[PDB]
Each structure stands twice: as structure tokens, then as C-alpha cells.
Ligand binder design. Structure first.
Ligand SMILES: CC(=O)Nc1cccc(F)c1C(=O)O
Length: 150
């Protein structure tokens, strides 16, 4: 019973979380997952400010109200060469990665590693936070409050 959570740098408190190396998070799960990091789904304004500080990914993830990819450099295989906060318009499917916003994070680029999952609750899952530099933090618990996400 294991969950891998790959996390990024935080940019103005915003970060990306990919679960189990594939698009696998529902919108309900995403809010619960961010809550475990004492975070919330970013607003579009928080995500735009993160982008301006250097945040970009090549993965769709939830924010409040939409599924987006923040892009700085045009790349043909990331949001069809678009820049800015690219908003997913048409998709058949519901599972993506998520973005989270931690208001207590530093104001600009924070590329230190994540070393805690501070607000997960008691549970049976071994949750491992995987940083881009490979460093890991694991803890037994749960963060999913909706049974349909389990
Ligand atoms: C203060 C701070 O940087 N908090 C965090 C940001 C992102 C993810 C996290 F788990 C945390 C934390 O509080 O450990």
C-alpha cells in the first residue's frame, strides 16, 4: 500500500505534485492532497505569479477552477508551444496531476527539497515524497477523504 508523490520547487508557494508517475489524481483527491501539505489548490492569480517567478512544468494539473500547464519557454510537446498559464479546454478525461499552494513558502523560487507531509492523517499507506533531486521523505498515513478516490 504505497503512494509516490513527486514534488517540485515552490515558486511563490506554488508547486507541482505528480502521483505514482502518471496522471492519476481526481479534483477531489487533489484538494485533499494539497491539504496534506498544509496547502490549497492555487488560484489562477497565484499560479500566474508563480509563473512570473520561474515556474513551468510540462504536465497538466489542477488549480482552482481549471486544469493548466504553466509555460515559460515554448516547447512543441508542452501545451502545444504556448507560453503563460495554458488552460486545458477539451479533454475526455478527469485525472491529472495537481498544483498546490503553500502560503508559508518563500516568496520567489524555493528549490530546497520537501522533507515533510505535515498534515496527512492516520492511515495505512506508505506515502513517499520524492524530490527532483531524488531525496525522499516517507510516512505512514492517508490524505484521501473521499472513498471513491481510494
Ligand atoms: C514553509 C514551507 O515551505 N512549507 C511547505 C511547502 C511545501 C510543501 C510542504 F510540505 C511544506 C511543509 O510545511 O512541510
Amino acid at each position: 500500500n504505497q503512494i509516490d508523490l513527486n514534488v517540485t520547487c515552490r515558486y511563490a508557494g506554488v508547486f507541482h505534485v505528480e502521483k505514482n508517475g502518471r496522471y492519476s489524481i481526481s479534483r477531489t483527491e487533489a484538494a485533499d492532497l494539497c491539504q496534506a501539505f498544509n496547502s490549497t489548490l492555487p488560484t489562477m492569480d497565484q499560479m500566474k505569479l508563480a509563473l512570473s517567478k520561474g515556474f513551468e512544468t510540462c504536465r497538466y494539473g489542477f488549480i482552482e477552477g481549471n486544469v493548466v500547464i504553466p509555460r515559460i519557454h515554448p516547447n512543441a510537446i508542452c501545451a502545444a508551444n504556448h507560453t503563460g498559464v495554458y488552460i486545458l479546454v477539451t479533454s475526455n478525461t478527469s485525472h491529472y496531476d495537481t498544483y498546490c499552494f503553500n502560503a508559508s513558502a518563500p516568496p520567489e523560487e524555493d528549490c530546497t527539497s520537501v522533507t515533510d507531509l505535515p498534515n496527512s492523517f492516520d492511515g495505512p499507506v506508505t506515502i513517499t515524497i520524492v524530490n527532483r533531486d531524488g531525496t525522499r521523505y516517507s510516512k505512514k498515513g492517508e490524505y484521501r477523504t473521499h472513498q471513491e478516490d481510494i
